[PDB]
C-alpha cells in the first residue's frame, strides 16, 4: 500500500523540504511571522446573512479552495490526505479508478480526489504537496454567506459567528475545522509547517449523526 | 535558497590553530549532516570529518584524528572546523559540504551535495612583504620581441599585473607564482610585441600587491 | 573505498566526444557517486549526483552512468568551456572518497616554443641577487625540457619553473624558468645558456648571453 503514494518529488527550488518526508524536527520557522500575517482573523470579515450558496496561501484558514477533481500523479509528492473530517489517505489509481502500485511513475497514474461533502459524500477536502514543495489543497466547494463590503468571507470552514448556518457540515472544505483548528494528521507539520506550535486537543465531531473522534491542532 | 557561507581567508603561522565557520542559510527544512573536505594546492580532494549538529556526533578521518575538531552552534545554524598544530602542508581550500535530498522516483530518493564557497588557509612562517619589480628587458627588426617584469620576493599571494594600465592584454602571460625556499613568492609576466615598436611604444607593467599596499609602475625599456 | 579514474589525461578537439571512467574498489551504496569539474582557481562544480542526475544548470552534453563499481562520465560535444580536470566521488557512506582526477585538454597541431633569455637587471644586481629568466612562449604539447648551462655546466637545484593554463585562443602553453644565483657566483661565470627540448623542435634550441656584453 505504501507503493500507492505518488512520489514525484524534485527540490529544484533548493529548500530541503524533502528532508521532512524522513527526518523530524527540522523546520525553520523564521519566515512564519511574515506569512501568517496574511491570514486575517474571522472578526475582520463581514457579517453574512440570507441563504447560503456555493462559490492563494493555503496556510490561511480562510483560503477558499476549488472543488476536488482528478490530478495527475506526476505533480504529487507524498501522501494525499482527505478529511471526512477524519484524516484518510488517497492513493494512486489509473484513470478508471483501479488502484495502482508504481509510486505514481506512470503517466496514466492519477489521484482521484473528486469530493462530495459527507454525509452523502466521501470527504470535505484534501491536502497534499506538489512536486516542488508547494502545499496544495482542494475541497468544498466553499460557501458564499452573503454580506456587504470588501472584507466579505467565502467561508471554507465553520464560520458560524458570521453566518449561523455556516457550520463545518455546511461549509467545511478541508482540514480546517474552525478558523483556529485544523485536523491533526501525520503530515500536518509538512503541509502546514507554520502550525508547529499549535496545541493538540481531543475533539468530537458529528456529521449527519456519525461521530468522528479526532485530534485537532489549535492556536 | 540553500547557501552555505564560509568565513574569509586566513594566514596562520606553523603550530597555530585556525577555526573556520560555515553558516547555513536559505533552508526551509534544515539538513542533518555537515562534512568538511579539503583541497591542497596541486593535490586532490580529501574528506576530513562529519558532524550531526542535533546529536553532536562527529567522526573524523584518520590523518586528521587528533588535530581536527568539528563543532556546532545549532541555534546559530553555524558549523565550525578547528585544525590545530598547523603544518605548512595544511595550506589548502577547506570546504563545508551538506547533503540534501534532491529528487525522488519509484519509491526511492537520491541525495545531492551543497557546497560552501571555500575557505583558504595559508600556513607560512613568513611576514607581509611587498615585491621588488625588476625589468626583463627586450633583447630583431621585423620580428617579435619579448619583454616582461619580474615580481620577486613578496608575501602573501596574490599580486596583480597589467600592462600599460590595461591597454595591453593580448600576448600577455602572467605565470603562476612560485614559492621560494625563503617562504616568499616570485612571479614573472611577459608580453610579446613587434620588434619595430621597441624604443617607440612605451611598455609599463603595473604591479599591485594589496596585502602590503605596494603599487609599482615599472617602465621596461631596451637595455643600452 | 578507492576510486580509480582513467584515462589520466586526454587530448581532444572541440565538438568531439569524451568518455571518463571511475572504478571503485568496493561497491557504492545507492549509486551515490558524484562527478565534479575542477577549473583552476574555481571551487569544484558538481556535474552529476546519484551517478546519472545532472545538477542544476549542467548542460545536456554531460551525462553519467554506471552502478556498483564501474561508473562513467561522458561529454557528447566538447565546447571551449568544457576543458578542465574532472573528479569522481562516492558518498554512499559517511567516509567520503574521491578519485584523483582526469584532465581534458584541447588537442592541437604541434607548435614549437619561441625561446627568449633575459639577463638579470642591474637594479637587482645592486641588491646582491641575480635571476636569469628563460621564456618558452606558445608551444604544444606541454611537455618541454629546460636546462640551464653556466659556462657549459648543466645546472640543477637552483631554478624554478611555472607554466600557464592552456590558452583560450590558440590552446598553447607557455613556460617560464628562473635561475637564481648570488651576485658573487653570477660574477664568477660568463656564458649563461638556456637549452630547450621540445617535440616541435628538430634539435634542442639554445639561447644565451655573455655577462656584461
Ligand atoms: C507547484 O506549485 C506552485 C505554486 O502553484 C507552482 O508554481 C507556479 O508555477 C506556474 C507555472 O510554472 C507559474 O506561472 C507562471 O508565472 C510567471 C510569472 O507571473 C508567468 O510569466 C508565466 O507565464 C506563463 O503563462 C502565461 C499564461 O498565463 C503565458 O502567456 C506565458 O508565456 C507563460 O507560458 C506563468 O503564468 C507561477 O508563477 C508559479 N508560482 C509560484 C508561487 O512559484 C509550481 O509550478 C508547481 N510545481 C509543479 C511541479 O507543478
Ligand atoms: C528537477 O527539476 C529541474 C528543473 O525543472 C530539472 O532541470 C531541468 O530539466 C529540464 C529537462 O532537461 C531542462 O530542460 C532543458 O532546457 C534546455 C535549456 O537550453 C537552452 O536552449 C533551449 C533551446 O536549445 C531553449 O528552449 C531554453 O530556453 C534554454 O535557453 C533545453 O536545451 C532542453 O531542450 C530542455 O528544454 C531544464 O533546463 C532543467 N533546468 C535546470 C536549470 O537544470 C531537473 O531535470 C529535475 N530533476 C529530475 C531528477 O527530474
Ligand atoms: C472527477 O473530476 C474530474 C475533473 O478533474 C472529471 O473529469 C472531467 O470531466 C469533465 C466532464 O464532467 C470534463 O469536462 C473534463 O475534461 C474532465 N477532466 C479530467 C481531468 O478528467 C471526472 O469526470 C470526475 N469524476 C466524477 C466522479 O464525476
Ligand atoms: C531560515 O529562514 C529565514 C527566513 O527565510 C532565512 O533568512 C533569510 O535568508 C535569505 C537568504 O540568505 C534572505 O534573502 C532573507 O532576507 C532572510 N530573511 C530573514 C527573515 O532573515 C534563514 O536563512 C533561514 N535559516 C536557515 C538556517 O536556513
Ligand atoms: C515555535 O516555538 C519555538 C520555541 O519553542 C520558537 O523558537 C519558534 O519560532 C516557534 N514557531 C512559531 C511559528 O511560533
| Residue bearing the CA closest to ligand 3, atom 27 | A114
The partner residue sitting opposite C123, judged by closest CB among B61, B99, B134, is B134
Contact A99, A195 (CB under 8 A): no
Tell me whether domains B3-123 and B132-220 share a fold: yes
Could you state, in order of their start, the residue ranges of all structural domains in chain B?
3-123, 132-220
Tell me the fold of B132-220.
Immunoglobulin-like (2.60.40)
User: C3-106: which CATH architecture?
Assistant: Sandwich (2.60)
Range of the domain at A116: 1-219
Half-sphere exposure of C22 (CA within 13 A, CB side): 34
What lies within 8 Å, CB to CB, of A94 at 6+ separation is A100, A106, A108, A109, A110
- Four-CA torsion A144, A148, A149, A153, nearest 10 degrees: -20
Ligand at shortest distance from the CA of A72: 3
CB A201 within 8 A of CB A144: no
Q: How many domains does chain A have?
A: 1
- Three-state SS sequence of B64-75: CCCCEEEEEECC
- Beta-strand runs (E) in chain B: 3-6, 10-12, 18-25, 34-39, 45-51, 58-60, 68-73, 78-83, 92-105, 108-115, 119-123, 132-136, 144-154, 160-163, 172-174, 178-179, 185-194, 203-209, 214-220
Chain B interface mutation, best of C44, C90, C207, highest count of B Cβ atoms under 10 Å: C44
**Grid coordinates representing A88?**
484518510
Q: Please tell me the distance between residue A29's alpha carbon and the centre of ligand 5 in angstroms.
A: 7
On chain A, the residues whose CB falls within 8 A of the CB of B102 are 10-11, 18
Which ligand places an atom closest to the C-alpha of C62? 2
Length of chain B: 224
Q: In terms of CA atoms, which chain B residue is nearest residue A2?
A: B107
Resolution (A): 2.6
Q: Report which secondary-structure segment, H or E, holds A168.
A: helix A168-171
CATH number of C114-210: 2.60.40.10
Q: A with B: how many residue pairs have Cβ under 8 Å apart?
A: 84
Smallest Cβ–Cβ distance between B100 and the set A11, A77, A193 belongs to: A11
Q: Phi, psi (5° rounding) for residue A70?
A: -105, 130
Q: How many residues does chain C have?
A: 213
CB of C210 less than 8 A from some CB of B: no
Task: Say yes or no: do domains C3-106 and C114-210 share a fold.
Answer: yes
User: In terms of CATH architecture, what is B3-123?
Assistant: Sandwich (2.60)
Query: Could you tell me the residue ranges of all domains in chain C?
Result: 3-106, 114-210
Element of type H or E holding C5: strand C3-6
Using CA of residue C121, residue C122, residue C127, residue C128, what is the dihedral sign?
Answer: positive
Residue B103's Cβ-side half-sphere holds a number of Cα atoms within 13 Å equal to 16
Report the C-alpha gap between A108 and A73 in whole angstroms.
8
Of B45, B132, B150, the CB nearest to C87: B45
Method used to obtain the model: X-ray
**Residue ranges of the alpha helices (H) in chain C?**
122-126, 183-188
Choose from C96, C112, C130 for mutation: most chain B CBs within 10 A.
C96
Amino acid at each position: 500500500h505504501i507503493n500507492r503514494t505518488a512520489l514525484n518529488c524534485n527540490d529544484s527550488l533548493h529548500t530541503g523540504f524533502l528532508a521532512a518526508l524522513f527526518y523530524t524536527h527540522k523546520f525553520n520557522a523564521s519566515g512564519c511571522p511574515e506569512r501568517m500575517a496574511h491570514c486575517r482573523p474571522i472578526d475582520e470579515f463581514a457579517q453574512g446573512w440570507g441563504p447560503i450558496t456555493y462559490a492563494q496561501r493555503p496556510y490561511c484558514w480562510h483560503y477558499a479552495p476549488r472543488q476536488c477533481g482528478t490530478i495527475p500523479a506526476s505533480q504529487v509528492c507524498g501522501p494525499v490526505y482527505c478529511f471526512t473530517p477524519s484524516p484518510v489517505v488517497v492513493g494512486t489509481t489509473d484513470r478508471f479508478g483501479a488502484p495502482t502500485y508504481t509510486w505514481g511513475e506512470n503517466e496514466t497514474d492519477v489521484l482521484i480526489l473528486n469530493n462530495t461533502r459527507p454525509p452523502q459524500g466521501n470527504w470535505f477536502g484534501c491536502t497534499w504537496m506538489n512536486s516542488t514543495g508547494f502545499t496544495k489543497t482542494c475541497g468544498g466547494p466553499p460557501c458564499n454567506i452573503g454580506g456587504v463590503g470588501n472584507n466579505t468571507l467565502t467561508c471554507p470552514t465553520d464560520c458560524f459567528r458570521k453566518h449561523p448556518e455556516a457550520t463545518y457540515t455546511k461549509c467545511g472544505s478541508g482540514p480546517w475545522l474552525t478558523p483556529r483548528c485544523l485536523v491533526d494528521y501525520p503530515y500536518r507539520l509538512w503541509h502546514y509547517p507554520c502550525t508547529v506550535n499549535f496545541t493538540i486537543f481531543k475533539v468530537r465531531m458529528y456529521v449527519g449523526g456519525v461521530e468522528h473522534r479526532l485530534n485537532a491542532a489549535c492556536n | 535558497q540553500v547557501q552555505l557561507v564560509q568565513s574569509g581567508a586566513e594566514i596562520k603561522k606553523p603550530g597555530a590553530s585556525v577555526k573556520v565557520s560555515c553558516k547555513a542559510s536559505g533552508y526551509t527544512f534544515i539538513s542533518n549532516y555537515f562534512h568538511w573536505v579539503r583541497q591542497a594546492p596541486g593535490q586532490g580532494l580529501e574528506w576530513m570529518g562529519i558532524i550531526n549538529p542535533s546529536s553532536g556526533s562527529t567522526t573524523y578521518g584518520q590523518k586528521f584524528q587528533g588535530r581536527v575538531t568539528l563543532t556546532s552552534d545549532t541555534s546559530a545554524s553555524i558549523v565550525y572546523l578547528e585544525l590545530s598544530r598547523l603544518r605548512s602542508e595544511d595550506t589548502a581550500v577547506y570546504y563545508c559540504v551538506s547533503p540534501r535530498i534532491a529528487h525522488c522516483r519509484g519509491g526511492r530518493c537520491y541525495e545531492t551535495l551543497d557546497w560552501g564557497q571555500g575557505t583558504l588557509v595559508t600556513v607560512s612562517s613568513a611576514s607581509t612583504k611587498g615585491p621588488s619589480v625588476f625589468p626583463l628587458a627586450p633583447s630583431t627588426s621585423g620580428g617579435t620581441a619579448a619583454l616582461g617584469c619580474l615580481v620577486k620576493d613578496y608575501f602573501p599571494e596574490p599580486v596583480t599585473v597589467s600592462w600599460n594600465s590595461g591597454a595591453l592584454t593580448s600576448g600577455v602571460h602572467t605565470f603562476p607564482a612560485v614559492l621560494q625556499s625563503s617562504g616568499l613568492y616570485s612571479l614573472s609576466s611577459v608580453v610579446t610585441v613587434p620588434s619595430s615598436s621597441l624604443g617607440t611604444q612605451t611598455y609599463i607593467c603595473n604591479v599591485n600587491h594589496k596585502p602590503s599596499n605596494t603599487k609599482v609602475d615599472k617602465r621596461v625599456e631596451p637595455k643600452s | 573505498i578507492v576510486l580509480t579514474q582513467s584515462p589520466v589525461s586526454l587530448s581532444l578537439s572541440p565538438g568531439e566526444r569524451a568518455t571518463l571512467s571511475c572504478r571503485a574498489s568496493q561497491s557504492v551504496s545507492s549509486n551515490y557517486l558524484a562527478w565534479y569539474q575542477l577549473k583552476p582557481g574555481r571551487a569544484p562544480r558538481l556535474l552529476i549526483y546519484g551517478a546519472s542526475s545532472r545538477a542544476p544548470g549542467i548542460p545536456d552534453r554531460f551525462s553519467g552512468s554506471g552502478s556498483g563499481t564501474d561508473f562513467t562520465l561522458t561529454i557528447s560535444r566538447l565546447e571551449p568551456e568544457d576543458f578542465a580536470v574532472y573528479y569522481c566521488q562516492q558518498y554512499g557512506i559517511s567516509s567520503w572518497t574521491f578519485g584523483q582526477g582526469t584532465k581534458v585538454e584541447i588537442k592541437r597541431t604541434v607548435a614549437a616554443p619561441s625561446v627568449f633569455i633575459f639577463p638579470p637587471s642591474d637594479e637587482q644586481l645592486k641588491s646582491g641577487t641575480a635571476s636569469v629568466v628563460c621564456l618558452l612562449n606558445n608551444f604544444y604539447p606541454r611537455e618541454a625540457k629546460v636546462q640551464w648551462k653556466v659556462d657549459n655546466a648543466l645546472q640543477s637545484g637552483n631554478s624554478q619553473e611555472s607554466v600557464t593554463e592552456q590558452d583560450s585562443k590558440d590552446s598553447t602553453y607557455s613556460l617560464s624558468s628562473t635561475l637564481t644565483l648570488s651576485k658573487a657566483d653570477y660574477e664568477k661565470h660568463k656564458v649563461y645558456a638556456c637549452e630547450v627540448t621540445h617535440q616541435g623542435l628538430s634539435s634542442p634550441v639554445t639561447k644565451s648571453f655573455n655577462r656584461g656584453e
